[PDB]
Ligand binder design. Structure first.
Ligand SMILES: Cc1cccc(C)c1C(=O)n1nc(-c2ccc(C(=O)O)cc2OCc2ccccc2)c2cc(Cl)ccc21
Ligand SMILES: Cc1cccc(C)c1C(=O)n1nc(-c2ccc(C(=O)O)cc2OCc2ccccc2)c2cc(Cl)ccc21
Lengths: 264, 259
């Protein structure tokens, strides 16, 4: 037997995922379903009030055009999330023992996929939690931002809605995020073997986890792995979309040091 | 939710049908590629002269492109016939049958093309010829770099060491994908797929007992399939805007028409 070891690994990852991330899926769902009401941002006037009252970092002026300020706010939050994911990664058994350059490579090419996944935990069909659950910004507001910005937001919701239909919880997600990080096919890896060995363990752990936590949900393991397809696809789209924005928009300028920090 | 004996029954059914539908199996392709036999030896095409001589025994970049296109159309036909054998498939809504094939055929062609490849080239003309990777990769203009990604994929996929019995179930899983755009009734597709996935999982554990998480590693390859089918389309579009000298079979045109 090694069931106990797989459960040990699951528990280890769950405990660490709780410590590393500000707002769990469990907490975010309580807020979204309406089980300390979040401040709601559904239009320009309500944004003005929220930033004036709740004082949201990421959406506070440092460009004066709202659509840009919100776009940049997403960029800023994603960079903050990279540090959370980084810290989480260090807790995955075997990860810190990898070649240092491979650690960096794994995080570099994994973070986009992870941020999409985890963003779904904070979204439903009607909008997204921000500032650790204190704010709730509506899908319609985001989707109706002008020019390319509105069309940049909506794909994230489309993805989340489909992902959320699997009804994963945090104990499930902790293992799934681990699997994503330990992907042996990232470009420029020096030593793939020990990465795939760790991944094989995480996959075993995720499989057992899903059978016990969702015994009625046939082939959930397979369905979840199939979602890596949608993850890679949307990360590719993401890059194409940013580039068009870079080429087109003249008014995106921040202080150079900010650009450096939030270069992403 | 299915008993083992039924999962084994379904694997046997699909293997049998794969054999009937596809002329050149992986098992036959490997026997040809590894050689050590007198009767099954391919003529090898590695340059212009050898191409000339190959036609006698069995613009160049266009001729080869058209060669690939022609085989691909044949492959669609073979895949379509295999699909009809998959329990439940013909029972689906007819529009959904079309949709499943439309999105699925390209992924399957790449999968099955890998069976005919090693790192040095690809079987052609039902195993009678072998064209080298170096020759294909050195075709001019856009054509060379349209050939090479096929090999890049095959080398990785072939590392899993699937056999035909395995691939029959894997191909079936690809076709019955409930996430294809425009599907009208996802539920009955996903119910068939869940059976195929159970069948694949048991098949892999029995046929490759020492190969840990082969199931998962195989599903992860559906990711690479989706990516390369997408790049394919982008690349073919760019070809279709330099090359009027090259035209596309209606069947493939239609498959591409709105992907
Ligand atoms: C820029 C980026 C790089 C990599 C991955 C993604 C998805 C993006 C991106 O385009 N994003 N990223 C958020 C976002 C992500 C994670 C969290 C969190 O708390 O875990 C929060 C996020 O956004 C909160 C937010 C929403 C609106 C304004 C400011 C912050 C994201 C969110 C949306 Cl709605 C759209 C695109 C997003
Ligand atoms: C044009 C096309 C449309 C749709 C799908 C694909 C992959 C292509 C394409 O770019 N292809 N397609 C082959 C090919 C596929 C399947 C078989 C087989 O027998 O099952 C054979 C194939 O090629 C045989 C061949 C190779 C060289 C010369 C003449 C025939 C394909 C093969 C390569 Cl090496 C590169 C691109 C290919």
């Amino acid at each position: 037997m090694e069931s106990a070891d797989l459960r040990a690994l699951a528990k280890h990852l769950y405990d660490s995922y709780i410590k590393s991330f500000p707002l769990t899926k469990a907490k975010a769902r309580a807020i979204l379903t309406g089980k300390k009401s979040p401040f709601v941002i559904y239009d320009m006037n309500s944004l003005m009030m929220g930033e004036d009252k709740i004082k949201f970092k990421h959406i506070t002026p440092l460009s004066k055009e709202v659509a840009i300020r919100i776009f940049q706010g997403c960029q800023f939050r994603s960079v903050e999330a990279v540090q959370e994911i980084t810290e989480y990664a260090k807790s995955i058994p075997g990860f810190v023992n990898l070649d240092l350059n491979d650690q960096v490579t794994l995080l570099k090419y994994g973070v986009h996929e992870i941020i999409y996944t985890m963003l779904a935990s904070l979204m439903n069909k009607d909008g997204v939690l921000i500032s650790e659950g204190q704010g709730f910004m509506t899908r319609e507001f985001l989707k109706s931002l002008r020019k390319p910005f509105g069309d940049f937001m909506e794909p994230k919701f489309e993805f989340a809605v489909k992902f959320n239909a699997l009804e994963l919880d945090d104990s499930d997600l902790a293992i799934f995020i681990a699997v994503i990080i330990l992907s042996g096919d990232r470009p420029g890896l020096l030593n793939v073997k020990p990465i795939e060995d760790i991944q094989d363990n995480l996959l075993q752990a995720l499989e057992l986890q899903l059978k016990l936590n969702h015994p009625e949900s046939s082939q959930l393991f397979a369905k979840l792995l199939q979602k890596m397809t949608d993850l890679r696809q949307i990360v590719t789209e993401h890059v194409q979309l940013l580039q068009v924005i870079k080429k087109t928009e003249t008014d995106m300028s921040l202080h150079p040091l900010l650009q450096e920090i939030y270069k992403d």
